[PDB]
Design a protein around this ligand. Structure first.
Ligand code: BDF
Lengths: 213, 217
């Protein structure tokens, strides 16, 4: 089956730059290739099809080239509206297949996360649940890892995370991780710790507290 | 040997949508008008929808007309029921039923029935969040945890909008309970803490709910 390999996975650039994104097919696909733009929480938008034909309304700064197995999308003079994910697709008579997408983001210097941990409030704890919150503030690039440890036990399967879009003033990301336990489980351990890893840190950073002061 | 099996079915909030399907064994549906019927908690049956051969005619009970759609797939032998803008009184066991059998005349009873799938519609279309402070302790962080509301969205300002710098309000996360949760945080000079009061203003329009929580060390 055709496999599409899209490079790079993330592309960091400044406004005004000309950038290229590529897609290689595992086997010849003539020019049966489309490029889509996608912003978070929105539908994909078709930009280019048959490798190089622009859809009506698409700005002329977008262009596509290639045939056979190698394809390129070029944006000549990036604008703020263009920071988004781009997807290539081989489309065939019955099926289709996508590359893994390329996230185009605004470039800035590496920033390690500033890390903060928050205990559950007594009020919430009285209701039978403990939410422990870890904040990773103002970091770049977007990849980070949070691990929770309770009394030094690596936890699994009991946290959820969310991440902001790049900050409009400083182009950083922030991330929140929440560890959720029952009051019974919460009150059986003392040390709660959020442990963070990011390329901007030379070692993991841990923030903790002892349950109840 | 002939059988029908409903799938989909579960818990729905009032106002929500849910789609059911019905697969069959040991007969083909093409020659039959297919039907959905439900049994309400008081015990009676209510005819819901009918779809005739080749989808020539689709008919609905008055109570569901305009909110429900029945479709059929003769090549793979399925029947569908879309239910939209659901109401408490849609709560019922839903069955698909075949009209006619090997005995196939111009008007037959419901000769074969599936075992039913349970659909429950909860009366609250919405629910306001609980807000919990995210208590602080160069620069300090604090924030508000906005828990267990539905549906999206919730809005968080700070000190009634005066404070905007250093604020991050995260995307809501859907909890395995079916309720949304988000956090909003802000970093402030840590020297400002034993002075300056911080209040998150949490607004949830769907439930007409406004909560102001003072976050302090
Ligand atoms: O609904 C009318 C009818 O003629 O449609 C085809 C078969 O379902 C018959 O059993 C049924 O009586």
């Amino acid at each position: 089956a055709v496999v599409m390999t899209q490079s790079p996975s993330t592309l960091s650039a400044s406004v005004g730059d000309t950038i290229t994104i590529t897609c290689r097919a595992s086997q010849s696909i003539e020019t049966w290739l489309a490029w889509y733009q996608q912003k978070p929480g929105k539908a994909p938008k078709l930009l280019i099809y048959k490798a190089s034909t622009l859809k009506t309304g698409v700005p002329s700064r977008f262009s596509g080239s290639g045939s056979g197995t190698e394809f390129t999308l070029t944006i000549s003079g990036l604008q703020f509206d263009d920071f988004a994910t781009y997807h290539c697709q081989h489309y065939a008579g019955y099926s289709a297949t996508f590359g893994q997408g390329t996230r185009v983001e605004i470039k800035r210097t590496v920033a390690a996360p500033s890390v903060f941990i928050f205990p559950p409030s007594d009020e919430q704890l009285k209701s039978g649940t403990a939410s422990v919150v870890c904040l990773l503030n103002n970091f770049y690039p977007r990849e980070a890892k949070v691990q929770w440890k309770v009394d030094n036990a690596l936890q699994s399967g009991n946290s959820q995370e969310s991440v902001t879009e790049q900050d409009s003033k400083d182009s950083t990301y922030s991330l929140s991780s929440t560890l959720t336990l029952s009051k019974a489980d919460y009150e059986k351990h003392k040390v709660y710790a959020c442990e963070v890893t990011h390329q901007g840190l030379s070692s993991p950073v841990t923030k903790s507290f002892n349950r109840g002061e | 040997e002939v059988q029908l099996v409903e799938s989909g079915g579960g818990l729905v909030k009032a106002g929500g949508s849910l789609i059911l399907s019905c697969g069959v064994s040991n007969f083909r549906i093409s020659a039959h008008t297919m039907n959905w019927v439900r049994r309400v908690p008081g015990g009676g049956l209510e005819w819901v929808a009918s779809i005739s051969t080749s989808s020539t005619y689709r008919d609905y009970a008055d109570a569901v007309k305009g909110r429900f759609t029945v479709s059929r797939d003769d090549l793979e032998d399925f029947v569908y029921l879309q239910m939209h803008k659901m109401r408490v009184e849609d709560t019922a066991i839903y069955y698909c039923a075949r009209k006619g059998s090997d005995r196939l005349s111009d008007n037959d009873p419901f000769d074969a029935w599936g075992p039913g799938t349970v659909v429950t519609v909860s009366p609250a279309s919405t629910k306001g969040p609980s807000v919990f402070p995210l208590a602080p302790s160069g620069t300090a962080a604090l924030g508000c945890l906005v828990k267990d509301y539905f549906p999206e969205p919730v809005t968080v300002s700070w000190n009634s909008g005066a404070l905007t710098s250093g604020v991050h309000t995260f995307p809501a996360v859907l909890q395995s309970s079916g309720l949304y949760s988000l956090s909003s945080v802000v970093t402030v000079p840590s020297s400002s803490l034993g002075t300056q009061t911080y209040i998150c203003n949490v607004n949830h329009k769907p439930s007409n709910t406004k909560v102001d929580k003072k976050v302090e060390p």
